């Protein structure tokens, strides 16, 4: 999100220039309104994705789920913030990129902080582990995790004795895949270019706008 100042940008602290600028009219108020609309829309965009359940559920204290291991994805309380290990790698990889220019240009802060967003994803994870799809349609109804997995196996068209007869093998495969995700993400060729390009585009656009001030336009 960003914001602009008509006068401080166009007329640099020059009161005669500021007086003369009044002739042109409503141009920069138009620009201000457009930018304000964008800024509000950003916070709405963040709200829609994550704020899907009112009720904030909590992680169970006992961590036995029939052999399925989720410690990689669940929040880790020891480290000061409740960020899961994978969220830690993500927040260390993306953030290679509130500036010295301030020629009338600021960068406003987001409305929801990262602690709040982490709380929301934790609520969804806890609800999903304990109850199945039920918590997004009504009140949460607990169910054992292997029975939930059998339900899903029926969903995709394989009978449910198969899960109960290969429970251990299935759990091992799932744990191994979760383990490998960390390394696949730690692979140097950045798969996070999608989120790096946003910061790159914004920084470069601001630099171009600022550098434009040292031009004469044929004067």
């Amino acid at each position: 999100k960003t914001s602009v100042d008509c006068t401080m940008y166009i007329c640099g602290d020059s009161t005669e220039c500021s007086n003369l600028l009044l002739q042109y009219g409503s141009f920069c108020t138009q620009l201000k309104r457009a930018l304000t609309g964008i800024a509000v829309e950003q916070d709405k965009n963040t709200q829609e994705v994550f704020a899907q359940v009112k009720q904030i559920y909590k992680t169970p204290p006992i961590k036995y789920f029939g052999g399925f291991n989720f410690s990689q994805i669940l929040p880790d309380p020891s480290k000061p913030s409740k960020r899961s290990p994978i969220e830690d790698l993500l927040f260390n990889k993306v953030t290679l990129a509130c500036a010295q220019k301030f020629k009338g240009l600021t960068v406003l802060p987001p409305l929801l902080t990262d602690e709040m967003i982490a709380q929301y994803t934790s609520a969804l994870l806890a609800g999903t582990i304990t109850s199945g799809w039920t918590f997004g349609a009504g009140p949460a109804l607990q169910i054992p995790f292997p029975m939930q997995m059998a339900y899903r196996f029926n969903g995709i068209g394989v009978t449910q004795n198969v899960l109960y007869e290969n429970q251990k093998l299935i759990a091992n495969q799932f744990n191994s895949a979760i383990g490998k995700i960390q390394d696949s993400l730690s692979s140097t060729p950045s798969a996070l270019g999608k989120l790096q390009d946003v910061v790159n585009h914004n920084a470069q656009a601001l630099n171009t706008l600022v550098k434009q001030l040292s031009s004469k336009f044929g004067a």
Partner: peptide, 20 residues
């Protein structure tokens, strides 16, 4: 594949899904 479940995870300016 055939979908079974997914787990969101937060990230800067977006979100990451894990599709089992």
């Amino acid at each position: 594949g055939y979908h079974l479940m997914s787990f969101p995870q937060s990230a800067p300016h977006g979100v990451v899904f894990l599709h089992v």
